[PDB]
Amino acid sequence: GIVLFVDFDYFYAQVEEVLNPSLKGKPVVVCVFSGRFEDSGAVATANYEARKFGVKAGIPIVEAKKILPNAVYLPMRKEVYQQVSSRIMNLLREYSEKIEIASIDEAYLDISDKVRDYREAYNLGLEIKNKILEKEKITVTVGISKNKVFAKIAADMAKPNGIKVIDDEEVKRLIRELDIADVPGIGNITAEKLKKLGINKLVDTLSIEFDKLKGMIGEAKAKYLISLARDEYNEPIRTRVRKSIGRIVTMKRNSRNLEEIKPYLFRAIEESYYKLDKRIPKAIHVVAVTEDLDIVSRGRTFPHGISKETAYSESVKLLQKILEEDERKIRRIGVRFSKFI
DNA sequence: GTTGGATGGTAG
DNA sequence: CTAACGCTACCATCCAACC
Ligand SMILES: Nc1nc2c(ncn2[C@H]2C[C@H](O)[C@@H](COP(=O)(O)OP(=O)(O)OP(=O)(O)O)O2)c(=O)[nH]1
Ligand SMILES: [Ca+2]
Ligand SMILES: [Ca+2]
Ligand SMILES: [Ca+2]
Ligand code: NA
Known about the structure:
By secondary structure, the protein is α+β, with helices and mostly antiparallel strands. The chain has twelve helices and twelve strands. The protein is 41% helix and 24% strand. Strands 5-6-1-7-8 form a five-stranded mixed beta sheet. Strands 9-12-10-11 form a four-stranded antiparallel beta sheet, with helices on one face. It has a three-stranded mixed beta sheet with strand order 3-2-4, with helices on both faces. A hairpin with a 4-residue loop joins strand 10 and strand 11 (295-301). The protein is globular and about 65 Å long. The structure holds 2'-deoxyguanosine-5'-triphosphate (DGT), calcium ion (3 copies) and sodium ion. The record marks 12 as: Substrate discrimination.
């Protein structure tokens, strides 16, 4: 059993360097503008040049301007990044039809039948990386291991433009010296809870009672960390199914006025009903970001699918609810559909 | 006891 | 307006309704 993992290098920023190569070698920052004021919004991603100076996903655009006033700031063009992603994902299918597309810029391939060993896997990694570069001009990191989770860790250790092959015998070694925070699924919260417990390496999970682990981080994730330490966690490659589709937009000013919020709500419904593309949901939720950036939601499950007309009607009702049940202003407003027929 | 539903969290 | 966009999977916690 051998899985190969691909993750595209500084993707949105790289696509922009492909479309305009006079950008190559200078810092590029791709931005989600929010129209609240001049350069309101956050950074989606930046190339490695920009990153060395602290510019990374999630910081405000104006924070990045204060560090790199002369970097190149381009608006995010999702549609274009998605066409490139699809072309590449189609490319990957020809190397294995057993492919799990995991996000806009990554995918897992089961290559068990395409190669006789890990050294041939490496060679296949080199070919995949070369062809992607030849056809779409985009560099990528490849991580090969015995299973998804280790294939992913392998890729993280190698980025950017790299390839790393942890084979079934080197995996044991990895478990011992992996930082617990470098485990996929362990963020700052979980990673910090675990320090309050002596667990710094992955392997340390095996030397602590199950209950104390389940107590701090819950059942699902405790079982996850333990089974991974024992090297008994071979989760299968499966085609991705969309379970929910939605859209959220940022208002030009905070408000609790229904008429002032509706235009944005309706824009989110229209856009997310288009993204639905013939799917028919039985669940709708209105999500609100509050002035203090907390997130509240209200929703309904119908026994039948929801028409665009029903969505318009019920979403106003759910927004009304939010406004009655919570006293703060709204800063962002959106909808999400789930439970497809 | 299940299990779906409403709502909120963590992560990538 | 004063810094913090958007997307979606999976999990947890409570609940009443169920077979
Ligand atoms: N708008 C937005 N897009 C994001 C955010 N995080 C990631 N993305 C998008 C933009 C990235 O180019 C793309 C892939 O994300 P990655 O996590 O793999 O990082 P990226 O490819 O940019 O750099 P890479 O070399 O891994 O480090 O996903 C975020 O917070 N906001
Ligand atoms: Ca990436
Ligand atoms: Ca990625
Ligand atoms: Ca982590
Ligand atoms: Na061997």
